[PDB]
Amino acid sequence: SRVCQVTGKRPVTGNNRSHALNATKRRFLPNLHSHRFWVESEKRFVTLRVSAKGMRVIDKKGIDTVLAELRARGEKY
Template sequence: MSKVCQVTGKRPVTGNNVSHAQNKTRRRFSPNLHTHRFWVEAEKRFVKLRVSAKGMRIIDKQGIEKVLADIRARGVKL
């Protein structure tokens, strides 16, 4: 499963590990993803989403129905 937030679209980014001696090695910064089940009252069922912490905050503010409508408008099947 890819490390992509279904709400925000956050993906891993690359950067450097930097030691005290300033040696640099490449690394990946992964988003803070969690698999979470959300109850959708309109559909009377749970929807399982892979969301970042910021994605959960967006769902808290806007509501799961609006967020699901936005995801489905992008063409993602849930």
């Protein structure tokens, strides 16, 4: 589904408030992208479906430190 594998963002819902405030339902989709990440430890490329915020987390924490907790949540990258 449309979930980020790092942060776990989900397609939340909301309203399309018009100018006259007619509320019609909508969805917010969380900017997902498939991106290959070079893990230096495993000496390979791991492809993850991350959001754009998830790349900044991988650019702030370690890739393998992030990938350590995908192992902890039972994700299967």
